[PDB]
Design a protein around this ligand. Structure first.
Ligand SMILES: [K+]
Ligand SMILES: [K+]
Ligand SMILES: [K+]
Ligand SMILES: [K+]
Ligand SMILES: [K+]
Ligand SMILES: [K+]
Length: 523
RNA sequence: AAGAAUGCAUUC
C-alpha cells in the first residue's frame, strides 16, 4: 500500500503548479490510514508469525518514501527562490546598478508557510504515534525519565510480559518516531537558516553571503538534538541519531564536535558502520583543520577560537599527521613549516592549564577511536604512543588535580582493550604516574564496589564499543534485571540522598578507580 | 642503542 501512496505522491509533487491543499489532504488521509493500520498490526501481533510483523518496515517506508520526499520537495522550492535572488543580485552587479538590487521577501514566505503547515501536520502525527507506543503497553525497559520528558503516564494497560520480542519492536517504533521528529526539526532549521532568513532583507542576505555561515545557529537546532538524545536514551546501540547530531555540528562549522559524534555513531553496538565514518573521513580530507591550525599559530585572526577549540584543532591535526599524512604531514611539519612537536607540546601544556573533563573525554574518544580505525601496524603503534603521551600528561595533572570521571574512563579503556593495556603497562611513566595518582586516594574497597545508579559517564557511554558497551569497574548485577530501568539512565530522583549525591558519587568513583587501578598495576 | 637534522618529540 505504501508503494501506491508513494506513486500518487510522486505524481503530485512532479506537477508544474503545486496544489498545497491537495498535498496536505493526501498526507492527512495517508496518515489516518497508517495509524489505524499500525494500531491493528500491533494488536494482532500474537496472532500471526512474528516474521510477518511488518510495522517496522512500513514505518521506515512511510518516512523514506512519503514524508521525507515531501520535505525535500519543499526544500527544493526554497532553493529555487534563493537562486532567483542570487540571479537578481548578479544581474544588478553586472549592469552597473548594485544599489538597485532588492531581495523580494514574498514567495519565500509563502513557500515556507506551506512547508511549516506540512511540518506541523507530521510533527503531530509522529508525536501521536510515539504517545500511543509509549503508553498503550507496559514496558519496564522505558526509563521514567523518557516518560517525564513527554509528560506521559502509563495506565493499567496491556501487559506484554509474554513477549519480550514484542516489547523490543514497540520500543524500536518509538525510537523511529523520535528519529523522525529530530529529522524533521533539523530539516526545518536548516531551511530557515539557509533559505528563509537570507531572503528576509538585504542585511540578512549579505551577512549570509559574506560570513559563510559562521553558524552560531545551534539555538535553531536545540529541539532536534533533544529528540536525537531521546533516541539515544531509548536505544543507545543504534547509530543514526549520533550521526545526525554530528551532521548538525558539521553544518554549524563545529567540526571537532561533528567528528566526535560521527565516531560515537561508528562505535555504537549496533552501528551500520558507514555513515559516521564516511562523514568523519570527508571532514578530515578537507582543509578546515589545517587552515584553523594556521590561523591559530599566526595568532592574529578573525576566527577567535576558545582554548577548548584550540586544543581540539591541535588534537585533530596531530592525529591526522599520523592517520592522514597526505593532508597533515610535510616532513617534520603538519602545514607550512608548523612542526608536529611544537603543536604536541602546546596541546600537552593546555591539558594542565585548561583541564576540562568533558573536553578531555571527547579527546580520548577521538584519539582512541582513530587508533581503533587504523589498520597499519606502524601507524597504529605511533597513534597509540601519542595517545599514551597524552594520557601520561593527564595522569601528571591528576597528581595534583581532580578528574575522577576522566580517570574512570581511561582505566576502563585499558581494561576492555588488552593490546592497549599491554602497551600501557610497558611504559614506565604510565605505571609510575598511575601509581602516584592512586596513592592519593584512600579506599577500604578490595572488590568491585556496588552502587545505587549509573553515573553520568556510564549513561553517556552505554553501548559504545570502545569500552565494550559498559563500564565494568562496578558490580552492577542488582541494576540489570529490568523490572525497572531508572537506575540505568542514572535517575537517582527516586533515591533519598538530597545533595549528598555528589559526595556519594565521588566516594563510589574513587573506590572503583582504586580497585580497578590496583588490578591494572598488579598485572 | 647510537649518529645526523628540525622544534622530550618528529623526520632519514
Ligand atoms: K531493535
Ligand atoms: K548531547
Ligand atoms: K554532514
Ligand atoms: K549523513
Ligand atoms: K572545537
Ligand atoms: K553523575
Amino acid at each position: 500500500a505504501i508503494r501506491t501512496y508513494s506513486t500518487q505522491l510522486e505524481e503530485i509533487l512532479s506537477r508544474k503548479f503545486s496544489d498545497h491543499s491537495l498535498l496536505l489532504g493526501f498526507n492527512a488521509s495517508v496518515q489516518a490510514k497508517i495509524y489505524t493500520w499500525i494500531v491493528n498490526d500491533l494488536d494482532q501481533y500474537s496472532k500471526h508469525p512474528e516474521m510477518e510483523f511488518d510495522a517496522i518496515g512500513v514505518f521506515d517506508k512511510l518516512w523514506t518514501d512519503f514524508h521525507y520526499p515531501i520535505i525535500k520537495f519543499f526544500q527544493q522550492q526554497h532553493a529555487v527562490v534563493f537562486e532567483e535572488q542570487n540571479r537578481e543580485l548578479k544581474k544588478c552587479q553586472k549592469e552597473g546598478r548594485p544599489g538597485e538590487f532588492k531581495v523580494r521577501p514574498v514567495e519565500m514566505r509563502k513557500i515556507n508557510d506551506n512547508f511549516m503547515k506540512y511540518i506541523k501536520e507530521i510533527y503531530q502525527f509522529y508525536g501521536k504515534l510515539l504517545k500511543y507506543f509509549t503508553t498503550k503497553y507496559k514496558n519496564p525497559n522505558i526509563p521514567d525519565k523518557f516518560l517525564e520528558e513527554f509528560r506521559f503516564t502509563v495506565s493499567g494497560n496491556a501487559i506484554e510480559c509474554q513477549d519480550d520480542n514484542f516489547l523490543g519492536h514497540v520500543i524500536h517504533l518509538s525510537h523511529k518516531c523520535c528519529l523522525c521528529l529530530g529529522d524533521m526539526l533539523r530539516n526545518q532549521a536548516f531551511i530557515d537558516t539557509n533559505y528563509v532568513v537570507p531572503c528576509l532583507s538585504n542585511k540578512e542576505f549579505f551577512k549570509f553571503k559574506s560570513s559563510p555561515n559562521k553558524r552560531n545557529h545551534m539555538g535553531s537546532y536545540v529541539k532536534a538534538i533533544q529528540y536525537y538524545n531521546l533516541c539515544i536514551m531509548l536505544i543507545p546501540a543504534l547509530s543514526e541519531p549520533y550521526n545526525q547530531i554530528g551532521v548538525i555540528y558539521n553544518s554549524v562549522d563545529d567540526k571537532f564536535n561533528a567528528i566526535y559524534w560521527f565516531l560515537r555513531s561508528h562505535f555504537s553496538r549496533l552501528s551500520e558502520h558507514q555513515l559516521g565514518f564516511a562523514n568523519m573521513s570527508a571532514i578530515l580530507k578537507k582543509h578546515w583543520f589545517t587552515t584553523a591550525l594556521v590561523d591559530i599559530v599566526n595568532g592574529n585572526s578573525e576566527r577567535r577560537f576558545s582554548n577548548a577549540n584550540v586544543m581540539n584543532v591541535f588534537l585533530v591535526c596531530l592525529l591526522g599527521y599520523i592517520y592522514c599524512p597526505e593532508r597533515y604531514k610535510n616532513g617534520p611539519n603538519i602545514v607550512k613549516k608548523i612542526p608536529f612537536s611544537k603543536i604536541e607540546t602546546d596541546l600537552f601544556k593546555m591539558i594542565s592549564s585548561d583541564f576540562d573533563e568533558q573536553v578531555v573525554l571527547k579527546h580520548l574518544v577521538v584519539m582512541f577511536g582513530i587508533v581503533r580505525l587504523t589498520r597499519e601496524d606502524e601507524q597504529r603503534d605511533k597513534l597509540l604512543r601519542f595517545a599514551f603521551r597524552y594520557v601520561e600528561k593527564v595522569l601528571v595533572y591528576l597528581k595534583t588535580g581532580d578528574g575522577l570521571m576522566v580517570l574512570r574512563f581511561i582505566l576502563n579503556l585499558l581494561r576492555e582493550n588488552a593490546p592497549w593495556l599491554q602497551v600501557f603497562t610497558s611504559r614506565r611513566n604510565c605505571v609510575v604516574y598511575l601509581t602516584a595518582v592512586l596513592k592519593r586516594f584512600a579506599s577500604d574497597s578490595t572488590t568491585r564496589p556496588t552502587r545505587m545508579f549509573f553515573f553520568e559517564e556510564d549513561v553517556n557511554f552505554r553501548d559504545c564499543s570502545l569500552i565494550k558497551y559498559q563500564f565494568k569497574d562496578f558490580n552492577d548485577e542488582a541494576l540489570f534485571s529490568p523490572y525497572i530501568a531508572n537506575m540505568v539512565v542514572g535517575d537517582y530522583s527516586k533515591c533519598d540522598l538530597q545533595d549528598a549525591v555528589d559526595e556519594y558519587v565521588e566516594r563510589k568513583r574513587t573506590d572503583a578507580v582504586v580497585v580497578l587501578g590496583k588490578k591494572i598495576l598488579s598485572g
